[PDB]
Amino acid sequence: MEIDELTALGGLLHDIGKPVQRAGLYSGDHSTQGARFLRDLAENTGRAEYELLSLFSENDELMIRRIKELSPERFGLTMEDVLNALWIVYEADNLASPQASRPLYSVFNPGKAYPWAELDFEKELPVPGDVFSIRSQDYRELVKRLWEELSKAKLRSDRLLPVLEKYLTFVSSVTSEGNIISLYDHMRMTSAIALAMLRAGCTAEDRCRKEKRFLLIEGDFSGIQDFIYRVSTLKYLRARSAYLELIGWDVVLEILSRLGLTRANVVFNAGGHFMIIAQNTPDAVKELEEIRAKAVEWLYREFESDLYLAIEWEPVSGREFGREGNLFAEARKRLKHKLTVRKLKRFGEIKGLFECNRLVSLGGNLPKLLGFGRTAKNDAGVLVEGPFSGFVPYLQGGRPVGEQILVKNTLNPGEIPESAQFVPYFVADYFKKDPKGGVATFEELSMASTGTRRLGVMKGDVDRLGEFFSSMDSPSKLATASRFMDYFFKGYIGAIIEGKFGYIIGDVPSLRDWPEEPDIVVVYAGGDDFFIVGAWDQIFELAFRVRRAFNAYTGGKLTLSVGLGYFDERTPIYRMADVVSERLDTAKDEGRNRVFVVGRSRPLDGKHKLSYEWNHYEELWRTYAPRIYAGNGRLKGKLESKKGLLWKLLEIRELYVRDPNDVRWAYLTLSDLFPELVGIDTKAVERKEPQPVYWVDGVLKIVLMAVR
Amino acid sequence: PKFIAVKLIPKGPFRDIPRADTLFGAIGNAISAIHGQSAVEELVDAFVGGARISSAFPYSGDTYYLPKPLSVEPALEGDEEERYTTAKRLRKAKYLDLKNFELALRLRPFTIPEEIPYARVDVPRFWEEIRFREKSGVYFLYSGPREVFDGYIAPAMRFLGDLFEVEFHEMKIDAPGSEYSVTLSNALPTKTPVLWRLLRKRMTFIAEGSIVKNDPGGMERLELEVYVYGLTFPLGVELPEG
Numbered sequence: 026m027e028i029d030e031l032t033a034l035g036g037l038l039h040d041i042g043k044p045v046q047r048a049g050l051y052s053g054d055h056s057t058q059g060a061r062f063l064r065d066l067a068e069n070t071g072r073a074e075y076e077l078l079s080l081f082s083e084n085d086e087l088m089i090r091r092i093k094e095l096s097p098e099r100f101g102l103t104m105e106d107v108l109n110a111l112w113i114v115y116e117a118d119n120l121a122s123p124q125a126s127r128p129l130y131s132v133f134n135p136g137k138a139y140p141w142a143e144l145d146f147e148k149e150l151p152v153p154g155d156v157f158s159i160r161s162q163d164y165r166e167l168v169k170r171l172w173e174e175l176s177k178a179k180l181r182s183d184r185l186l187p188v189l190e191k192y193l194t195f196v197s198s199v200t201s202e203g204n205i206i207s208l209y210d211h212m213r214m215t216s217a218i219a220l221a222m223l224r225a226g227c228t229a230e231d232r233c234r235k236e237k238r239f240l241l242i243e244g245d246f247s248g249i250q251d252f253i254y255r256v257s258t259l260k261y262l263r264a265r266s267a268y269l270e271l272i273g274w275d276v277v278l279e280i281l282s283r284l285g286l287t288r289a290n291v292v293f294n295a296g297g298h299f300m301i302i303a304q305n306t307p308d309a310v311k312e313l314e315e316i317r318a319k320a321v322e323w324l325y326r327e328f329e330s331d332l333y334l335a336i337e338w339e340p341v342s343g344r345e346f347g348r349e350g351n352l353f354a355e356a357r358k359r360l361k362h363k364l365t366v367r368k369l370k371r372f373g374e375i376k377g378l379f380e381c382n383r384l385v386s387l388g389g390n391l392p393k394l395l396g397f398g399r400t401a402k403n404d405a406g407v408l409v410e411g412p413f414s415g416f417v418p419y420l421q422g423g424r425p426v427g428e429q430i431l432v433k434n435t436l437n438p439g440e441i442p443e444s445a446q447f448v449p450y451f452v453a454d455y456f457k458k459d460p461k462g463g464v465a466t467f468e469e470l471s472m473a474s475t476g477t478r479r480l481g482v483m484k485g486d487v488d489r490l491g492e493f494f495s496s497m498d499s500p501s502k503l504a505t506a507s508r509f510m511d512y513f514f515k516g517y518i519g520a521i522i523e524g525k526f527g528y529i530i531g532d533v534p535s536l537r538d539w540p541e542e543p544d545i546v547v548v549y550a551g552g553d554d555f556f557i558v559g560a561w562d563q564i565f566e567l568a569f570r571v572r573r574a575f576n577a578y579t580g581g582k583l584t585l586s587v588g589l590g591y592f593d594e595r596t597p598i599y600r601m602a603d604v605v606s607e608r609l610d611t612a613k614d615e616g617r618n619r620v621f622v623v624g625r626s627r628p629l630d631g632k633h634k635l636s637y638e639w640n641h642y643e644e645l646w647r648t649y650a651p652r653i654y655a656g657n658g659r660l661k662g663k664l665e666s667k668k669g670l671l672w673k674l675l676e677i678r679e680l681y682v683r684d685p686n687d688v689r690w691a692y693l694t695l696s697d698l699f700p701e702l703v704g705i706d707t708k709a710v711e712r713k714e715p716q717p718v719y720w721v722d723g724v725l726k727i728v729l730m731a732v733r
Numbered sequence: 734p735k736f737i738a739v740k741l742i743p744k745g746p747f748r749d750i751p752r753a754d755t756l757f758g759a760i761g762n763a764i765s766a767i768h769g770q771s772a773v774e775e776l777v778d779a780f781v782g783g784a785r786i787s788s789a790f791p792y793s794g795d796t797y798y799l800p801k802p803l804s805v806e807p808a809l810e811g812d813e814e815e816r817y818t819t820a821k822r823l824r825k826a827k828y829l830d831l832k833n834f835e836l837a838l839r840l841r842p843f844t845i846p847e848e849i850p851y852a853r854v855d856v857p858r859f860w861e862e863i864r865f866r867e868k869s870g871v872y873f874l875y876s877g878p879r880e881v882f883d884g885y886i887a888p889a890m891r892f893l894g895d896l897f898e899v900e901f902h903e904m905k906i907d908a909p910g911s912e913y914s915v916t917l918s919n920a921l922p923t924k925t926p927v928l929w930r931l932l933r934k935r936m937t938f939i940a941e942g943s944i945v946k947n948d949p950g951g952m953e954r955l956e957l958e959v960y961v962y963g964l965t966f967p968l969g970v971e972l973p974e975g
């Protein structure tokens with residue numbers, strides 16, 4: 026052990042007394058009961074480091090002696106070192122900032138609460154629901170698996186974080202009413218803040234609190250879609266999206282390495298947007314200025330002015346991690362400004378400014394790969410290179426290679442060497458498999474559609490997220506907000522595609538029975554954002570499935586906007602991206618919480634929106650589809666020999682689009698079918714809204730595609 | 734300052750809204766075909782001398798549009814939900830009407846064109862074109878001596894007309910006297926600039942609306958002799974302290 030690993034693991038276990046109190050195993054408070062748990066665990070297996078780490082959960086007279094009894098020489102630590110490690114972690118616990126039956130209340134809707142369960146994307150979707158007390162049994166079953174895992178863990182921050190994440194994710198860090206913060210997040214943030222204070226070179230201070238000894242480090246990529254899309258195949262396009270992820274990780278892990286920090290210091294890293302808490306020593310800002318420049322120079326040489334990385338940082342004090350009358354949002358706002366300016370000075374860190382086959386193999390070797398190894402660039406097996414490291418694909422049979430191993434969609438290392446640092450990375454990587462073992466193609470997906478053979482595209486984004494995050498008070502609140510948000514796209518979109526959460530989703534607009542292996546391929550999904558292609562009819566339905574899943578996942582408190590596209594399978598990817606983009610930021614431009622279902626004619630009188638409110642379209646489908654649509658590409662049959670009355674309404678709606686004030690569409694109008702459309706709706710004219718006829722095309726045009 | 738607006742009334746649709754390099758490129762070619770390469774040399778001399786052309790911008794009726802200066806981007810804070818959503822729609826706007834351009838230069842409150850008088854239709858077969866609204870089109874600004882306008886720019890534009898016809902009027906932009914200026918042209922910067930958007934063609938160009946501090950840009954001659962226009966068309970711009 027050295028002081029730096031002790032201060033990390035220190036703040037990372039300070040409040041592990043909470044789960045053991047709430048189990049009722051010892052007879053004390055969390056600080057006392059936490060001390061007993063780790064000492065009892067230390068003796069079991071026989072690793073004395075846990076008895077060193079038990080001092081954190083607790084005039085200074087008694088404590089100096091309890092430190093002395095644990096001979097500090099043993100772990101190559103000074104007595105005076107450990108005393109700071111303790112005091113440092115004590116301050117950290119306060120900056121990241123009552124029954125014992127209370128559950129974790131949802132950061133999205135603090136009115137609703139999470140049922141006690143362990144983070145597993147395979148089983149069930151976390152839905153904030155009715156407030157239920159968690160039994161002291163569930164906490165005991167928790168504390169034992171938790172005890173069994175710490176027994177086998179290698180006692181580095183990267184082996185401890187994952188097991189604290191798996192079990193303590195759905196636990197209230199404090200058992201107050203409307204408590205928003207996951208315990209794991211409070212633990213990783215105290216470890217982050219504590220280690221930052223250490224590197225800042227401050228000790229025995231009660232100084233670091235009211236002096237700018239910290240750094241907020243927000244890194245943001247500009248022109249992500251100008252990098253991923255705008256290509257000359259899907260296998261490739263996925264490796265583009267996958268290559269962007271490794272580049273970002275190569276930069277983050279480099280920052281953590283050179284500043285001497287741990288993954289706990291990563292507040293978030295999703296959608297190519299990463300934040301890091303760190304020391305404000307000059308060596309740090311020098312090490313930062315070195316990295317930022319060497320990274321940009323690599324990006325320029327490798328891709329020209331297509332992909333830029335805007336990295337900025339602000340000197341921040343302990344005050345500004347907390348609220349006084351909201352300083353934390355204020356510190357993030359001043360930093361977002363530093364970024365906006367750096368994004369208007371793209372490649373300004375180059376003075377010489379004003380004077381890939383590897384992805385195909387990566388795209389081909391993509392189905393059976395567990396992760397990648399972060400080695401030096403010149404090393405055997407290196408398939409792709411980032412600015413700072415070569416990346417070695419890690420396959421089911423082979424050994425991993427390198428200082429860091431990046432492993433996909435698990436929080437358990439598996440069989441990786443004891444010395445190798447474990448880096449869990451989650452990604453929404455669903456894809457329909459071919460007759461061949463490889464991922465499907467635009468052609469095959471398009472062929473597998475009900476009716477018309479178009480490729481389906483949807484670009485989806487969360488409405489007013491920036492506002493939601495700037496309303497967070499403390500680092501730990503942002504951490505829970507960040508992680509839960511990111512895990513919906515990176516974790517659960519996979520399950521939502523598979524056909525899970527049937528009861529939570531319910532009856533959505535649909536054309537066929539939901540398949541077992543759906544014709545869907547995820548391109549990008551992470552940090553409030555997703556791009557997904559597949560059979561148009563399966564893509565159309567998934568839009569409503571994802572919107573409902575998200576409605577339930579949030580407390581009906583956050584909304585999506587989605588743009589849908591139904592394209593000729595031969596249309597190039599860059600043209601598809603611009604149209605769904607055009608359709609997405611239209612759906613946002615026409616208000617938010619709405620979907621661009623299909624392209625449409627309309628009056629340009631500024632009273633007629635192309636986009637539909639999710640609830641508006643869902644009502645229209647429920648109303649009209651069942652009268653005219655039987656399912657699986659077949660009509661009601663009363664309609665057989667009358668597929669013509671539907672086309673006639675689309676022509677009647679067109680003479681409402683010619684002029685909505687001309688009362689001829691009343692003249693033109695079995696007639697039972699659609700009685701809502703024959704009358705000249707009056708409240709609509711009073712309220713200054715479109716006539717019912719204007720809206721129906723959204724349903725009919727989708728049915729007529731399914732039936733052709 | 735007061736300038737000559739060269740109005741291009743289109744006789745059909747356009748492929749590009751041309752920017753300063755391609756405008757000079759076209760005028761350079763026309764003057765070769767009319768007066769030989771002695772006239773091209775006299776034109777480069779006038780331009781290296783202090784004469785400037787802007788990039789082409791849209792006009793609709795008696796409404797001239799100009800490029801949104803990148804100066805306002807970091808100053809947009811100068812409600813909660815009213816703020817974010819507008820601040821993005823401003824950040825996406827690529828043009829302002831003359832009146833709101835002159836306000837944006839002085840960091841006073843301004844507003845956006847609700848309709849831009851052109852749309853990029855891209856018919857499949859695939860390549861694209863630009864459809865102009867009624868009595869709408871594209872124009873560019875000339876600053877410098879009248880004798881250079883009459884004897885080079887005017888003849889060249891008429892020759893290039895023969896897809897459009899050409900008429901020109903006097904136009905005035907009020908701009909703050911300042912250390913800092915916007916370019917109404919895409920430029921090859923000599924000094925490193927203040928605020929900018931890169932623009933790849935192979936040359937690395939500063940975009941229209943970029944902010945420079947006393948940068949005249951420069952011309953580049955090369956062999957394939959051809960001159961490449963990258964001179965700044967500066968108007969003084971008030972900057973926010975950041």
Ligand SMILES: Nc1ncnc2c1ncn2[C@@H]1O[C@H](COP(=O)(O)OP(=O)(O)OP(=O)(O)O)[C@@H](O)[C@H]1O
Binds near residue numbers: 508554
């Ligand atoms: N999981 C996440 N954790 C942290 N930051 C995130 C996460 N997801 C997205 N972000 C960041 O939050 C910001 C919000 O981006 P975006 O513009 O898409 O949302 P917004 O502010 O709600 O705007 P709009 O509603 O107009 O789309 C971006 O800086 C983005 O990178």
Ligand SMILES: [Mn+2]
Binds near residue numbers: 491
């Ligand atoms: Mn968003």
Ligand SMILES: [Mn+2]
Binds near residue numbers: 296487552553
């Ligand atoms: Mn986004």
